[PDB]
From Swiss-Prot:
Expressed in immune cells in the lung (at protein level). The phosphorylated form at Ser-71 is expressed in normal breast tissue cells but not in breast cancer cells. Keywords: Acetylation, Cell cycle, Cytoplasm, Isomerase, Nucleus, Phosphoprotein, Rotamase. InterPro entries: PPIase_dom_sf (IPR046357), PPIase_Pin1 (IPR051370), PPIase_PpiC (IPR000297), PPIase_PpiC_CS (IPR023058), WW_dom (IPR001202), WW_dom_sf (IPR036020). The lineage of its organism: Eukaryota, Metazoa, Chordata, Craniata, Vertebrata. Phosphorylation at Ser-71 by DAPK1 results in inhibition of its catalytic activity, nuclear localization, and its ability to induce centrosome amplification, chromosome instability and cell transformation. Ser-71 is dephosphorylated upon IL33-stimulation of dendritic cells. This is Peptidyl-prolyl cis-trans isomerase NIMA-interacting 1.
Length: 163
């Protein structure tokens, strides 16, 4: 996930190494699209959307004592706790959104969840994915703002958002 495709279920992105309008592929209707996965809003592209009912609202997950198991991907040990949990995030919180750090490295060298080795926990949805209190993040900024510590039924995540 968040490594191969970058769209909802049914439509896949190929990019195609050649200009001339971007096309799409389907399956549920054996029909080839040639416009955009429209249905709820104008996601993807770049910007311009009054009713953003679907975005790449991500949420990094830094393993810690406030998780299912305080185990480091490399260190193999995480004695630290909330004392370095919310802090560890603040260390990057003011750098990634500073156009001086693409959203991926931290996930491919820290994240524990899927984002760990999937360049992204989930990515984008159509309306809802999980934790209701989690969705209350993306729709509260202007892209590339990072929601920061949202505080949910897990510990401490970060909604970077890339759409």
């Amino acid at each position: 996930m968040a490594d191969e495709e970058k769209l909802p279920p049914g439509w896949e992105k190929r990019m195609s190494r050649s200009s001339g309008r971007v096309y799409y592929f389907n399956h549920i209707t054996n029909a080839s699209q040639w416009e955009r996965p429209s249905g709820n809003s104008s996601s993807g592209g770049k910007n311009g959307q009054g009713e953003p009912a679907r975005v790449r609202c991500s949420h990094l997950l830094v393993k810690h004592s406030q998780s299912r198991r305080p185990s480091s991907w490399r260190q193999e040990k995480i004695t630290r706790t909330k004392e370095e949990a919310l802090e560890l995030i603040n260390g990057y919180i003011q750098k990634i959104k500073s156009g001086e750090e693409d959203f991926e490295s931290l996930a491919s060298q820290f994240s524990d969840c899927s984002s760990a080795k999937a360049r992204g926990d989930l990515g984008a949805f159509s309306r809802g994915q999980m934790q209701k209190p989690f969705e209350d993040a993306s729709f509260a900024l202007r892209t590339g703002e990072m929601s920061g510590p949202v505080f949910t039924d897990s510990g401490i995540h970060i909604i970077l958002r890339t759409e």
